[PDB]
Structure 1
């Protein structure tokens, strides 16, 4: 570990725990292509089990970047098209409000203001059909951006239907395995239970709860080494041997919509690098934003700040990287603390190694 990286990581990271009371953090940094791992604290304060590089954290929203890439994959394979209407992959959806609503709307949170969360009373396929059949859009499609789980959750449920495989099974055979992410799981098995860290909310130990469309939007738990390999894949997609997966990544970093100084992609968010720090810091705080369509979707711009946040009841996660300098940083922790603290911390560390 070079002294510069080590120093700045510690002098930036240690106060964050001290101020945010975070039980355990894993922090990986990618510099000139080489990863570096750092840990702090305890994975299980009750069983005095620490946080290691094989300790699993619930990624939460950062699962949506996985769900994006897995769709772009099927775009490359020709099984699904980003322009088709929703009803072509779901004929039983006989509601007239869905007319005009493509899969780009489903993916980039521009479907007309679909709810941010899937209701807890929705458990069976029939309940899910009625939920989306009775929903009525706030706005026209393609006009306003409302971040939502249920919009992206359905995109990833429908993006694998022609291929005949479950979403877990597609994910594993088409992204997880080929990239040698062997410790990232949708459903944690008993064998890895020991690596599973408990989240702490309000002092109480908590894990992610089963839900409708939960794998598709916030069901992906992973380890700090697999996040490092995943960032390394997203830095430079040309080294992936599989041509559909490379294209799937490259599509995921494509700018489909623009709102303020941010761009919407397939699970990721892009910013023209260099960026004003304070602007994006207030942009990462927790609403209805309207978007100016980019015709046509821009291809992946190397000199971009590509980032995404992930939050769960008991965990917080942040991933950011800049292709142009071959730099990146990921933070994962078993307490959901404010996102602008993550972002401030990423910005200082990355600016120092820049």
Structure 2
């Protein structure tokens, strides 16, 4: 690799791993259409398996970027519209609070205060109807952003209905296959368990538990190589041969709402480049708190802006993830770790790395 990339990465991540006590980590720097990969430590501490470029990490909420792009692809295929009422795709959702609630609202956490998690007690389709029917919004739709797996989760399940496919089958055939993401899974197959890192929470090996709408919200597992290939796809969507996917990518990085310096996409979140990293490390958008934030409608949404810092953070109980990229500079980073560690620390490291290379 270029020494500059070697040097800044090792100098940023090595202290990070020490301070946060991360068992294993994988990083990709994507620069001018080329990836550069770094690994540290252990996928499996007990079996002394090292992190490699084929190690699978749980992405957590970075999964939502796939969901965003899959939904944007369904839009480009003419199957759904973000302006459509939720009840168009789920007519059994007859409770009156759902009047005015669109697929845009679900996709961007603006439905009016959908809760962070689908409850664990929700298992069947009947349970899921019951849960959504019985939810009472705090706010009118399109007024406040509150981050929620139950919001974008439902968006993901409804977006694929007209296709005829299960979410998993739609994602595989429409996003993973076309982009050649061959080591990216919603369900890790027995053949790949050898590559699947354990997460560590309080020093215990853990994997993400099954739950309603897990695939759509936090359930994707991937390797650093496939994740770099994902960053490259989102950095240069016009290089993509499949027209509805290329368009779906652009729809996912479009700006639908503003709060402070952040713009809400479909899965992806954006700031204007150059960025002052204080809001995303120290201030209102550092993700420490679950934050109800009034939003300004971007009417109509701004098409994907090249001069953006585009990012998404994710966690499961055992894992911490981060992806950020600047299409203008043809520059991106993926950071995958098998311990959940504070988001500000993730963003601080990413910023130091990309600010130095840009």
Instruction: Answer yes or no: is the 8 Å Cα contact 1:284–1:343 preserved in 2.
Output: no
Tell me how far apart the structure 1 counterparts of residues 234 and 191 of structure 2 sit (CA, whole Å): 29
Residues 235-288 of structure 1: per-residue CA shift (max 9 Å, x gap): 010010000000000000000000001000000110011111222212476610
Residues 31-61 of structure 1: per-residue CA shift (max 9 Å, x gap): 1111000000000000000100000000010
Change (3 A) 1:217 1:284: farther
Instruction: Answer yes or no: is the 8 Å Cα contact 1:41–1:50 preserved in 2.
Output: yes
Tell me how far apart the structure 2 counterparts of residues 277 and 310 of structure 1 sit (CA, whole Å): 18
Q: TM-score normalized by structure 1? A: 0.99
Following TM superposition, by how much is the alpha carbon of 1:119 offset from its aligned partner in structure 2, in angstroms? 0.5
Hey, what does 2:321 align to over in structure 1? 317
Instruction: Answer yes or no: is the 8 Å Cα contact 2:27–2:333 preserved in 1.
Output: yes
Instruction: Answer yes or no: is the 8 Å Cα contact 1:27–1:37 preserved in 2.
Output: yes
Residues 140-182 of structure 1: per-residue CA shift (max 9 Å, x gap): 0000000000000000000000011100000000000000000
Gaps of 5+ in 2: none
Instruction: Answer yes or no: is the 8 Å Cα contact 2:307–2:326 preserved in 1.
Output: yes
Residues 43-91 of structure 1: per-residue CA shift (max 9 Å, x gap): 0000000100000000010000000000000000001111110101001
Of residues 205-214 and 271-280 in structure 1, the stretch that sits farther from structure 2 once superposed is 271-280
Instruction: Answer yes or no: is the 8 Å Cα contact 1:284–1:340 preserved in 2.
Output: no
Tell me how far apart the structure 2 counterparts of residues 97 and 296 of structure 1 sit (CA, whole Å): 25
Instruction: Answer yes or no: is the 8 Å Cα contact 1:285–1:339 preserved in 2.
Output: no
What is the RMSD computed on CA atoms of the aligned residues?
0.8
3-state secondary structure, aligned to 2:232? helix
Instruction: Answer yes or no: is the 8 Å Cα contact 2:255–2:304 preserved in 1.
Output: yes
Change (3 A) 1:244 1:214: same
Length, aligned pairs only: 354
Following TM superposition, by how much is the alpha carbon of 1:21 offset from its aligned partner in structure 2, in angstroms? 0.4
Off by >6 Å, runs of 4+ in structure 1: none
3-state secondary structure, aligned to 1:313? coil
3-state secondary structure, aligned to 2:115? coil
3-state secondary structure, aligned to 2:91? coil
Tell me how far apart the structure 2 counterparts of residues 278 and 77 of structure 1 sit (CA, whole Å): 39
Tell me how far apart the structure 2 counterparts of residues 61 and 284 of structure 1 sit (CA, whole Å): 19
Instruction: Answer yes or no: is the 8 Å Cα contact 1:199–1:205 preserved in 2.
Output: yes
Instruction: Answer yes or no: is the 8 Å Cα contact 1:69–1:252 preserved in 2.
Output: yes
Change (3 A) 1:195 1:218: same
3-state secondary structure, aligned to 1:38? strand
Residues 277-328 of structure 1: per-residue CA shift (max 9 Å, x gap): 2222124766101101110100000010000001110000000000001011
Q: TM-score normalized by structure 2? A: 0.98
3-state secondary structure, aligned to 2:184? coil
Tell me how far apart the structure 2 counterparts of residues 279 and 171 of structure 1 sit (CA, whole Å): 32
Instruction: Answer yes or no: is the 8 Å Cα contact 2:23–2:41 preserved in 1.
Output: yes
How do 1:38-49 residues align onto structure 2 when only pairs under 5 Å count? 38-49=38-49
Tell me how far apart the structure 1 counterparts of residues 3 and 327 of structure 2 sit (CA, whole Å): 23
Instruction: Answer yes or no: is the 8 Å Cα contact 2:279–2:285 preserved in 1.
Output: no
Tell me how far apart the structure 2 counterparts of residues 81 and 272 of structure 1 sit (CA, whole Å): 27
3-state secondary structure, aligned to 1:178? helix
